[PDB]
Design a protein around this ligand. Structure first.
Ligand SMILES: CCCCCCCCCCCCCCCCCC(=O)OC[C@H](COP(=O)(O)OCCN)OC(=O)CCCCCCCCCCCCCCCCC
Lengths: 63, 57
């Protein structure tokens, strides 16, 4: 292989490995923030579904 | 001129007219917490795949 092909193949390899490395760092910082603040799709622990509540008039008024 | 109600009459659900307005916040509920932002858009392939260690897919 001529030096140019190897040289520019290396830049293609370096770009992918650099892009992946940045994403890995972003993922770790995104995970840290989502877990601490609970404001994202991850670490979304379920709460009781409010469609289970019955809003009909009851046997007694004060409820 | 009082007529005794027949069987079942007094258990009917009836409608009643009133002026008193319908209460707005009868439970005295606070403002509900804001929902988490919706995630929306076009689902695209993961960038460079799984990206787990050395895997290229
Ligand atoms: C397993 C073979 C190696 C044996 C030695 C074991 C080494 C240690 C194993 C530990 C795990 C390390 C595996 C390293 C490879 C995984 C990283 C990787 O390469 O991911 C991408 C890979 C496809 O590689 P890619 O660059 O896309 O090449 C495409 C060519 N068309 O996609 C993959 O992840 C799957 C690749 C697994 C490699 C084997 C599959 C290649 C196809 C061979 C199947 C056999 C076909 C012939 C069947 C004969 C039937 C009679």
């Amino acid at each position: 292989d001529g030096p140019e092909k190897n040289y520019e193949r290396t830049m293609a390899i370096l770009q992918i490995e650099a892009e992946k490395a940045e994403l890995r760092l972003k993922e770790l910082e995104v995970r840290r923030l989502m877990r601490a603040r609970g404001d994202g799709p991850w670490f979304h622990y379920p709460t009781i579904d409010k469609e289970l509540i019955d809003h009909s008039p009851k046997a007694t008024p004060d409820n | 001129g009082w007529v005794r109600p027949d069987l079942g009459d007094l258990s009917k659900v009836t409608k009643v007219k009133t002026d008193r307005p319908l209460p707005e916040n009868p439970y005295h509920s606070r403002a509900r917490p804001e929902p988490n932002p919706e995630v929306e858009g076009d689902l695209k392939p993961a960038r460079h795949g799984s990206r787990l260690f050395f895997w290229t897919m």
